[PDB]
Amino acid sequence: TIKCVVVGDGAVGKTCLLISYTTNKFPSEYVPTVFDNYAVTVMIGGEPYTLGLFDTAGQEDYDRLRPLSYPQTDVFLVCFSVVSPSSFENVKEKWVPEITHHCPKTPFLLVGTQIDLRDDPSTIEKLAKNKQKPITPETAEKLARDLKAVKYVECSALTQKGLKNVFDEAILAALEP
């Protein structure tokens, strides 16, 4: 089993991406706050791999509890919504310090989510009215190298775009020194 732990702020779409990836369907109704941990078989270059997927609760309420799921993690997924700059800022302020403190040698991916919303007129107009803008791949990739992520990947759980690659890269990160 390769243990993959998904972390990040609330509402960035951690649960939906795990469900979308494991079911091949974007969930449109109710959804667990925390996806029960689930194992899936992934084929990488003819070889089979068992990916163990763990969801987390990102809120401050669970600061003391959440890391108790970190032991023997093989790779982290630090997620932020590309249309939520505050979740992007928390990548640096909260999430990477938290995982490097508990698992300093464990590799991590920087994951942009909900990229379909960069092409959502209502979404951008609402950011602009707040003098904000979506996160670009340029700035995210800068952050990934400044914070020593393995790399930056982005996806949409809704369209499944980039979704498969996220977890392929998660596995490749975990099979390393």
Binding site: Y30, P32, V34, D61, L65, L68, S86
Partner: protein
């Protein structure tokens, strides 16, 4: 806050007294309820590796680590729904209620059934385009209205109403939700907490009626908390609106639908940091304003 010297013809003071008592016993009834705690304990342990659990088992603080997050969620919800208005709000509510469209002629069961069905449909494209679905929900509403008519509300009546409001489901579905669920950044109660306070909301509805508490305000509070609790796997929104509108139509008030797209996410806690948060009494005020617009030009 003291309301003793304020004008009141809605028995708002009796309502506030009722809210004071429930809020006072909230820690004992919910936060310290062992079923709720066990539910939290089991939820928390699922993700924790077996060996870590065993190393944590010797720590005096282990139980609190297991349960603190779940308790803070219920507390945040209780804070959002608990009615404790400012002097000014107390007075504005007094004034706002006099403005409500109110009929004295008592509608009959089929008329109330139709008004509640149309209210449901008003905010639902699916119901509008699907007569089979609209007719099924209408039957459910008619059944609930006829069973609760002249009687104290029971949780059983609600369970049946919720089932009736979920016709497209299939067989063998769970009635209550089995886990913490969310949609659209919403924060709802845990399954056990939602059941406990569903029961309290029923007692509240019955008590409020017996004490002659203004139904338009009762309806507002019930709308907020039933949605905040969301005990069932599905149809919590429909169920809340039917119960609320029974309360309103029985008093001669118009049917409520929803809040605006902007204000609705302010009535319960959200997982989105940016979303604003309204107090219970602010929700009542807004509820009354929306209800007052019901026959208007904007309608």
């Amino acid at each position: 806050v003291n309301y003793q010297d304020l004008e009141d013809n809605l028995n708002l003071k009796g309502l506030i007294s009722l809210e004071d008592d429930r809020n006072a016993n909230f820690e004992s009834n919910v936060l310290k309820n062992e079923k709720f705690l066990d539910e939290a304990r089991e939820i928390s342990k699922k993700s924790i590796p077996e060996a870590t659990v065993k190393q944590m088992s010797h720590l005096p603080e282990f139980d609190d680590i297991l349960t603190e997050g779940a308790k803070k969620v219920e507390s945040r919800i209780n804070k959002a729904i608990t009615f404790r208005p400012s002097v000014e709000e107390f007075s504005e509510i007094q004034d706002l209620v006099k403005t409500l469209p109110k009929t004295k002629v008592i509608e009959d069961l089929s008329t109330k059934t139709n008004e509640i069905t149309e209210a449901l449909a008003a905010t639902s494209k699916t119901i509008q385009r699907t007569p089979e679905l609209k007719e099924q929900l209408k039957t459910a509403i008619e059944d609930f209205l006829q069973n609760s008519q002249g009687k104290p509300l029971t949780v059983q009546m609600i369970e049946n109403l919720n089932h009736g409001l979920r016709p497209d489901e299939g067989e063998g579905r769970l009635l209550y939700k089995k886990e913490n669920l969310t949609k659209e950044n919403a924060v709802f109660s845990s399954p056990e907490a939602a059941k406990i306070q569903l029961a309290e909301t029923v007692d509240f509805i019955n008590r409020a009626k017996n004490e002659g508490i203004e139904p338009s305000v009762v309806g507002a509070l019930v709308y907020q908390r039933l949605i905040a609790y969301a005990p069932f796997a599905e149809g919590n929104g429909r169920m809340a609106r039917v119960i609320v509108n029974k309360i309103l139509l029985d008093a001669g008030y118009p049917a409520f639908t929803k809040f605006s797209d902007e204000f609705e996410p302010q009535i319960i806690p959200q997982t989105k940091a940016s979303t604003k948060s309204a107090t219970s009494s602010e929700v009542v005020v807004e509820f009354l304003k929306e209800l007052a617009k019901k026959g208007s030009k904007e309608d």
